[PDB]
Design a protein around this ligand. Structure first.
Ligand SMILES: [Cl-]
Ligand SMILES: [Cl-]
Length: 57
């Protein structure tokens, strides 16, 4: 139910892989969820319906 990707700092987006396709969604604007570092791990959680561009590492 979690789908991983990488984020764009410039666009504040997460590009994640799900069911063979790449999907681009905006990251949150929240301080500790936005894409802070370019190409950082992000995740779309399809169960909780959330995006985080500061996935714990
Ligand atoms: Cl695709
Ligand atoms: Cl969200």
């Amino acid at each position: 139910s979690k789908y991983g990707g990488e984020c764009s700092k410039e666009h504040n987006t997460c590009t994640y892989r799900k069911d063979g396709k790449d999907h681009i969604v905006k990251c949150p604007s929240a301080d500790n969820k936005k894409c802070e570092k370019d190409k950082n791990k992000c995740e779309y959680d399809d169960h909780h319906k959330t995006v985080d561009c500061q996935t714990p590492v």
